């Protein structure tokens, strides 16, 4: 438009409504519910329980974000607290727990199994069939223990999270197809079946009377 | 010691008798 | 996430328009209600234990649920259900001070239908629970305060149906 | 279970990182004894240096109970 | 149950079951019979179990049976004995198990969570289980009686 | 305190203060006058707070203080009002940091723990922290009695 | 997973049943059986790489599979093959002392056929070699345990067809 | 916004919102007031604030308005004033917000791989900022000035 | 990924065939062509920035998306754009060094169209931009090494679409 | 850890040693106490609560250690102090089973007087609980299983101090 | 950490004191130092980066470190020398706003003597240049800030020496 200040002019939008916001694609959200997370020595009990509780929610998942007593490994969190361990060691004991091995290796099948492992050590769906296949074959031919010290030994583990970060819900894009998964796993996949065998519910009694 | 406490207490415990008043639901 | 401040701030940034008056407007009225939402908060966060307790008496409890068979039978799913309430308790106070319902959308809303279906909780009680939770925090947080409340409540009950 | 007790140091040759990395460079931790020697690889291949090593943990030599 | 808790490890460590672990399977098929006539007794006294143990809670915690206390009212004085048949039920469920898995996952996990939110004080319901305890023990034989006092045990360690 | 609990979301992210956690800080000093008047007040009456509400709690709960009952004998009534001077302490502490940081380490982390092994009753705690605050507010200006109001109810949340 | 035992036990805990004469009657049924279980197991676990071996010699090798074209053409497929052989064979042996086919549904057999389908492994030649197996470990474990032994691996071959 | 960022640091921590945190929102609602006038001030003053600071910056750096620099010719430096104009509106939004998290996702993030690609000299852009800065602040009341001069200086920060 | 020499080995091991001479004539054929393709490479490598830069004038920047409300709006958009440019042409570069494309449907192409409907990234818009940046190379790497560098970014482009 | 039984084994090994009767004999005695030890640690599992109780109240509270400037001053520490006891009794309990005290040294003992001395722990104040434990423990095992009880208990006093 | 405010509350609780008038004195002179904190707070985070490169021309570089040989020779190196320079800045602004030295004792300042050592940094010329920081910080922030912020910059230098 002539009469009005070229650098007015070039700001101006065509389109107005009907136009992509900021929350559009990737969105604000996921970046900010990310902190990084290191204990300190020196930290104060508040700080560093604050941590701890983002360890179980993360590895165990705790959606309500703080651990029920029977779920909590007292032993581990003393050392942690001493700074005898590494947040990376404390990982790693966490999954040889037996109540990871309750709620998530017993109920689910292999290939799944090896889904949630990604998730809650490294953040992220699986990358691909051949990784897949790896974490399988040591699930079957050692332990789930085995498996859970290859994740945290893994390559991957050390570069984005190293022994001092706390693992975090991180939707990569590196590899292809990873950020769709990731965010399928993150976000839609909430944990849908019981870790317990006992006491069944019935379909019925839906509504209260 | 809990001095302060010690004696303030006997004297709440003198002026009031608990053991009757029941509980009230309220 | 979006607040009240923000989702005026980005219909203005779609258009590329400077803030003007009546977008101010917004942002006025936003500023008079926000007093009352952080006392309505406080109310809330304080009593949230008693809310959950007589939301249930009031829905969930003494019923065929907590019977045997019933999903809230088990003390693992009593205690999974009361959690739950709690989370949705939380959520709910963020997007009345928020003074948008985007949050819900994201985090409590997000696959909650499908996982609820997958195992067995009944989501027909669970909007019960939530109805039941309005009602006693509108009594908590006064008239002027419930109208507010009252409409986070009524958008998670609406998404989990 | 033998543990060891391990001090290292770690410098970061490929990349420089903003966020404080203190932790991760000078690091006394406790490591069970069937994770030791992937764990000595794994600093050995970055390039730290291992200052110390003690068994926390264990008895020298011993046949059973290890 | 025993095997249960035995295949679940093996499975976890991708092996075989151990010779130990089926010396343990064995013990316990043997023992089985035992169990089982443990229960039916259990099974067959429950309501004078449940009525003598609800009168010695009673009348060790006059508060529970107040107007301040939980219990106050019939209906709340017959919820406080339901829940204390429920527990009874669990612990045979566990003596046939040969484990407290069944028990566990059934009473004890969130059994803290629960009780908070209604109220109930949990140590008068460890009481009351105690209290279950001894009634059994009396009908139960001295070899039974002990296998049963383990599992009511536990009920009473978790509670707390 | 404001403080601290800024810096520390600054330090995880490795970043200056933003300008939102400035103004916080600002707001915060400017207010600093105001909160040592309401500690003040609440620690000169410290002594009629405890005891007045005590005596609330008394007769709200009289089983306690009763031969059945934990609290009861003189030297178990006085270690329960020796409880509540201590958590009177803890709220104007509070008060003055303007968050709850000094409160929660202090008293209430590993609070159930215990008092569940001391037997006394948690779900009566509360009570007495409710009574307190009833006393305490009666004592403070309309807008003050608010600011204290909040760290009374954090005690009776988080509990 | 869940046993025997605590499949009796889940019947009558949704009922809300104490436990009663005609469920301890199959709870009884359980424990004479349970002593052979053992037998049989140990058996399957000392004579397991021979099973694997027979039966692949029965069914899948000396075949066009191997051959080149063949799924289990080429050394890594020809090891997943006999991976997967081990796991049928130490999932029925749980099952087998479990009474139980539960195990095999939970970890086995969910989403077994999808992965073979997407993989391209042959349903039909896996089931062979479910059915080869069962008739070596036949052999080992004697007849009584056979009858019991049979019934896990039919399951599994059913699952998979 | 504050209230954003209250909500997101209570949801990390898997709690309530705090008194404290609860306090700092109150003060922000009370503020907003005097946060909207400041808002309005220089939306008003904008297509001067924009021309004068762009001059100064032009005075600051002969090199970028000449053939060599990137605002070189009419187009290029509408161009150069158009991202002038651009973070002051960002600025605007921020002061009203009373917070940057508005700025930062528009402007600040990925801003320097954005400018590399342009091959446009950061610290030039940010001394286009600071200009911009003083245009505004002669504009402002001394204390509303001191509110936009943080909200300035964040944008100077972030790119350098 | 596969080049073209394994995908010669490959198809005459499924078959199970040793290599014959026609099988030797394909692979002859590559490597006549493997000397142009690494100086190619080279080029691209090292005129990369200047690469996407040239393109996302010709098509991308000075629109309607660099516009407010346009995708490529915001510096977080703008600088993801870029990014996903320079993905393209380093996996191009890879391919033309391989004489194959399936490291592109491995890599690139799989996924790609549904990530981008859920983000909103218009792909004509992107296919727009990759065949600028084909046309640039094209100028740098000289001819010869054109048209082998176009059927890659081609194939990229049709993937897309 | 190592219990009665390997240690014996433990022994004969470095010896390259078949078990002999003197060996056997060692065993043999482990085999008698056995009962008398599994009754003892069940009668501490269900009154370890109440021992810790008592045994505090004995020796830690109304003292100066509870009141300001005492390492068992404000609740953090109060409950660290009597998770401390809670582990001490159950370590205790499971080396009585065991009949070795090699499991106190390697999971307790180990590091504990350092830590203690960093933290500000008083070490003599420690041992008096545990002291105060075992005499409580004493009383509700029975003098048999009370000598058992007491070594162990007495190894852990020696170890911290 | 700890901050002015909570080093107070510190004290007074060890001593299990209620706060008195001559605590409050020392919270009081906290609060009017605050302001002016703020405001060099701001200052220095705006001039963040031109702080760094005058305090590297007065004492880093043009000197035998840059030159080969010198720990700060090669560009990794450069930059992790003036990374670790940034990071002094920026915590010993936070400490001039929390008011006590203590934050730089716990994140700072704890193991920096033992990672240079090993690394081969040289400490005096690090101290160099936190104290070249600080006269150039001291000219930005203005004379009363920089009494305030002169005393953090001793006590990290203090700490490295
Ligand atoms: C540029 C020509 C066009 C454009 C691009 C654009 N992309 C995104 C966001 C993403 N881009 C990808 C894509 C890839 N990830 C991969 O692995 C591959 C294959 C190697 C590609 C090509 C992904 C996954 C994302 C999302 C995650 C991320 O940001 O890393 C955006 C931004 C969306 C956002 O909200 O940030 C944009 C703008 N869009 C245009 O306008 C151009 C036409
Ligand atoms: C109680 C009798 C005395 C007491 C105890 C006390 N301990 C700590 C802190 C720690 N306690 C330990 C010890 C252990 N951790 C373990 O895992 C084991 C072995 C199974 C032991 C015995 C540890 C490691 C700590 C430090 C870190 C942590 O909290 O876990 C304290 C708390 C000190 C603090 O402020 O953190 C206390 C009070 N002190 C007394 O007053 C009693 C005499
Ligand atoms: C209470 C009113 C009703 C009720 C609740 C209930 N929920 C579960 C199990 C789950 N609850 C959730 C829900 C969430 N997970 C999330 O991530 C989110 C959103 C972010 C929510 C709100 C999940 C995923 C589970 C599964 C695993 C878990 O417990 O963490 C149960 C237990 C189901 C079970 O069989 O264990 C129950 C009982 N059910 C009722 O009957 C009430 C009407
Ligand atoms: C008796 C020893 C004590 C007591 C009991 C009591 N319970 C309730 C209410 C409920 N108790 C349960 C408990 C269970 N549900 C389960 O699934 C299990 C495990 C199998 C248990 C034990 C439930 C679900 C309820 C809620 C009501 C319902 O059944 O639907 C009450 C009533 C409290 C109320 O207000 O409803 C009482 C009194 N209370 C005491 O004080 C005794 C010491
Ligand atoms: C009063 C509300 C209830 C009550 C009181 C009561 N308290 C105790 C004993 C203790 N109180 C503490 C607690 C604290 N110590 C701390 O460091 C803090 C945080 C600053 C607190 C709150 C301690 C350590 C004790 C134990 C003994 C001691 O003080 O040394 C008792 C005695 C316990 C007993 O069982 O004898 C009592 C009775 N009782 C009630 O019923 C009221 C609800
Ligand atoms: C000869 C050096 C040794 C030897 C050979 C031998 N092999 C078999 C059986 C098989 N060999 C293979 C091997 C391959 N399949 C592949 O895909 C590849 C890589 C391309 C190889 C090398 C297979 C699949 C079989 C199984 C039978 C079949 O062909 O379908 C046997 C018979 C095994 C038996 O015990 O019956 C033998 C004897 N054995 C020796 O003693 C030599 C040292
Ligand atoms: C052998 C009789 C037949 C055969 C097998 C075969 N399987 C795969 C690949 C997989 N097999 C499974 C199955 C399981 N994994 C488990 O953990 C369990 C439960 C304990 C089972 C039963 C899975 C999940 C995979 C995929 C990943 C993996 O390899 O672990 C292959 C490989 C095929 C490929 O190209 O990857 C093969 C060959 N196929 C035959 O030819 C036989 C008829
Ligand atoms: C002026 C101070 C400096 C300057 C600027 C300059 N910019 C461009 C081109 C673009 N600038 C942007 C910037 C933005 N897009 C955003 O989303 C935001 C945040 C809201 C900003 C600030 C964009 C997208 C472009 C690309 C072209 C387009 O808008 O479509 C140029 C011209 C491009 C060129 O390189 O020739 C210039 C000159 N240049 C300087 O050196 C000044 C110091
Ligand atoms: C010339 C092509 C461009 C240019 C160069 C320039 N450099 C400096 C100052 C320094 N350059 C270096 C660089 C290095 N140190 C190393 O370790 C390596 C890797 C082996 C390099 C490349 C250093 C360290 C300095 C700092 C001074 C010193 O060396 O002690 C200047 C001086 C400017 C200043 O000091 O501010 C200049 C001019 N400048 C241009 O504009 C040319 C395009
Ligand atoms: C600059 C004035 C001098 C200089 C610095 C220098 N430092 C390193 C390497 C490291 N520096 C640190 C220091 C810190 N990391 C932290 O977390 C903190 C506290 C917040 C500090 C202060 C660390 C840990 C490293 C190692 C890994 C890393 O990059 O962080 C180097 C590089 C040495 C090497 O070879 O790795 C240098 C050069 N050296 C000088 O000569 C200047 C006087």
Same mark, same amino acid.
């Given at each position: 438009?002539?009469?009005?200040?070229?650098?007015?002019? /070039?700001?101006? !939008?065509?389109?107005?409504?009907?136009?992509?916001?900021? %929350?559009?694609? =990737?969105?604000?959200?996921? +970046?900010? #519910?990310?902190?990084?997370?290191?204990?300190?020595?020196?930290?104060?009990?508040?700080?560093?329980?604050?941590?701890?509780?983002?360890?179980?929610?993360?590895?165990?998942?705790?959606?309500?974000?703080?651990?029920?007593?029977? /779920?909590?490994? !007292?032993?581990?969190?003393?050392?942690?607290?001493?700074? %005898?361990?590494? =947040?990376?060691?404390?990982? +790693?004991? #966490?999954?040889?727990?037996?109540?990871?091995?309750?709620?998530?290796?017993?109920?689910?099948?292999?290939?799944?199994?090896?889904?949630?492992?990604?998730?809650?050590?490294?953040?992220?769906?699986?990358?691909?069939?051949?990784?897949?296949?790896?974490?399988?074959?040591?699930?079957?031919?050692?332990?789930?223990?085995?498996? =859970?010290?290859?994740?945290?030994?893994?390559?991957?583990?050390?570069?984005?999270?190293?022994?001092?970060?706390?693992?975090?819900?991180?939707?990569?894009?590196?590899?292809?197809?990873?950020?769709?998964?990731?965010?399928?796993?993150?976000?839609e996949e909430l944990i849908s079946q019981s870790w317990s065998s006992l006491s069944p519910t019935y379909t019925g009694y839906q509504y209260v009377t | 010691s809990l001095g302060s406490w010690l004696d303030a207490a006997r004297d709440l415990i003198s002026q009031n008798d608990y053991s009757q008043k029941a509980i009230e639901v309220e | 996430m979006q607040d009240a401040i923000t989702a005026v701030i980005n219909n203005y940034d779609v258009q590329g328009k400077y803030l003007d008056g009546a977008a101010l407007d917004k942002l006025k009225a936003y500023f008079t209600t926000g007093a009352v939402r952080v006392r309505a908060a406080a109310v809330i966060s304080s009593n949230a234990t008693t809310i959950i307790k007589e939301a249930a008496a009031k829905a969930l409890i003494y019923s065929d649920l907590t019977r045997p068979g019933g999903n809230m039978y088990t003390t693992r799913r009593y205690a999974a259900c009361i959690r739950d309430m709690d989370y949705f308790l939380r959520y709910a106070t963020y997007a009345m001070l928020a003074g948008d319902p985007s949050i819900l959308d994201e985090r409590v809303l997000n696959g909650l239908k499908e996982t609820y279906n997958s195992l067995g909780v009944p989501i027909a009680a669970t909007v019960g629970g939530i109805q039941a939770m309005k009602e006693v925090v509108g009594g908590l947080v006064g008239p002027d305060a419930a109208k507010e409340a009252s409409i986070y409540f009524d958008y998670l009950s609406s998404g989990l149906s | 279970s033998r543990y060891f007790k391990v001090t290292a140091c770690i410098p970061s040759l490929k990349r420089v990182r903003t966020g404080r990395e203190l932790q991760n460079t000078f690091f006394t931790k406790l490591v069970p004894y069937e994770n030791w020697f992937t764990e000595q690889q794994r600093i050995q291949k970055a390039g730290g240096k291992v200052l110390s090593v003690k068994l926390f943990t264990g008895v020298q030599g011993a046949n059973t109970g290890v | 149950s025993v095997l249960t808790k035995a295949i679940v490890n093996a499975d976890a460590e991708a092996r075989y079951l151990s010779p130990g672990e089926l010396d343990r399977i064995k013990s316990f098929v043997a023992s089985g019979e035992r169990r089982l006539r443990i229960a039916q007794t259990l099974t067959e006294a429950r309501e004078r179990i449940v009525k003598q143990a609800g009168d010695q809670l009673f009348q060790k915690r006059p508060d529970v049976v107040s107007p301040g206390g939980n219990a106050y009212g019939e209906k709340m004085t017959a919820l406080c004995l339901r829940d204390l048949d429920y527990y009874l039920r669990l612990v045979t469920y566990g003596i046939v198990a040969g484990d407290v898995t069944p028990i566990e996952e059934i009473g004890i996990i969130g059994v803290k969570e629960m009780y908070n939110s209604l109220q109930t004080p949990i140590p008068a319901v460890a009481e009351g289980v105690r209290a279950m305890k001894n009634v059994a023990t009396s009908l139960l034989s001295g070899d039974d009686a002990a296998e049963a006092g383990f599992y009511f045990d536990y009920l009473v360690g978790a509670m707390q």
């Amino acid at each position: 438009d002539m009469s009005r200040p070229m650098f007015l002019e /070039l700001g101006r !939008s065509f389109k107005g409504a009907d136009g992509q916001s900021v %929350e559009v694609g =990737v969105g604000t959200l996921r +970046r900010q #519910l990310e902190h990084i997370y290191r204990i300190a020595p020196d930290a104060t009990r508040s700080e560093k329980d604050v941590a701890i509780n983002a360890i179980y929610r993360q590895v165990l998942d705790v959606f309500a974000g703080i651990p029920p007593s029977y /779920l909590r490994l !007292s032993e581990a969190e003393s050392k942690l607290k001493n700074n %005898e361990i590494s =947040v990376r060691e404390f990982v +790693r004991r #966490l999954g040889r727990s037996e109540n990871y091995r309750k709620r998530f290796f017993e109920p689910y099948s292999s290939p799944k199994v090896v889904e949630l492992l990604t998730k809650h050590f490294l953040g992220r769906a699986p990358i691909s069939q051949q990784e897949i296949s790896t974490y399988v074959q040591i699930l079957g031919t050692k332990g789930l223990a085995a498996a =859970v010290d290859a994740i945290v030994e893994s390559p991957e583990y050390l570069t984005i999270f190293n022994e001092d970060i706390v693992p975090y819900r991180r939707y990569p894009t590196l590899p292809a197809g990873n950020y769709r998964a990731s965010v399928r796993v993150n976000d839609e996949e909430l944990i849908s079946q019981s870790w317990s065998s006992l006491s069944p519910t019935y379909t019925g009694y839906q509504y209260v009377t | 010691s809990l001095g302060s406490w010690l004696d303030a207490a006997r004297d709440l415990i003198s002026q009031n008798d608990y053991s009757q008043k029941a509980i009230e639901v309220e | 996430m979006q607040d009240a401040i923000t989702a005026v701030i980005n219909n203005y940034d779609v258009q590329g328009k400077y803030l003007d008056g009546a977008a101010l407007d917004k942002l006025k009225a936003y500023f008079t209600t926000g007093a009352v939402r952080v006392r309505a908060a406080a109310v809330i966060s304080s009593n949230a234990t008693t809310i959950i307790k007589e939301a249930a008496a009031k829905a969930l409890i003494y019923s065929d649920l907590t019977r045997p068979g019933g999903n809230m039978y088990t003390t693992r799913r009593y205690a999974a259900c009361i959690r739950d309430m709690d989370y949705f308790l939380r959520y709910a106070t963020y997007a009345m001070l928020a003074g948008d319902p985007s949050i819900l959308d994201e985090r409590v809303l997000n696959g909650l239908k499908e996982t609820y279906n997958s195992l067995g909780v009944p989501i027909a009680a669970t909007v019960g629970g939530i109805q039941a939770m309005k009602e006693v925090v509108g009594g908590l947080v006064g008239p002027d305060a419930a109208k507010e409340a009252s409409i986070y409540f009524d958008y998670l009950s609406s998404g989990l149906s | 279970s033998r543990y060891f007790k391990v001090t290292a140091c770690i410098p970061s040759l490929k990349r420089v990182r903003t966020g404080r990395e203190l932790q991760n460079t000078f690091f006394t931790k406790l490591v069970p004894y069937e994770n030791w020697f992937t764990e000595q690889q794994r600093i050995q291949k970055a390039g730290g240096k291992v200052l110390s090593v003690k068994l926390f943990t264990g008895v020298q030599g011993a046949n059973t109970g290890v | 149950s025993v095997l249960t808790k035995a295949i679940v490890n093996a499975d976890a460590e991708a092996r075989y079951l151990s010779p130990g672990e089926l010396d343990r399977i064995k013990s316990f098929v043997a023992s089985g019979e035992r169990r089982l006539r443990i229960a039916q007794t259990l099974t067959e006294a429950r309501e004078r179990i449940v009525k003598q143990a609800g009168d010695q809670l009673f009348q060790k915690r006059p508060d529970v049976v107040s107007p301040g206390g939980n219990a106050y009212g019939e209906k709340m004085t017959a919820l406080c004995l339901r829940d204390l048949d429920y527990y009874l039920r669990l612990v045979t469920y566990g003596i046939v198990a040969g484990d407290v898995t069944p028990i566990e996952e059934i009473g004890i996990i969130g059994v803290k969570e629960m009780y908070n939110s209604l109220q109930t004080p949990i140590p008068a319901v460890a009481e009351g289980v105690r209290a279950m305890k001894n009634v059994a023990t009396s009908l139960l034989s001295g070899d039974d009686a002990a296998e049963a006092g383990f599992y009511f045990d536990y009920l009473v360690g978790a509670m707390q």
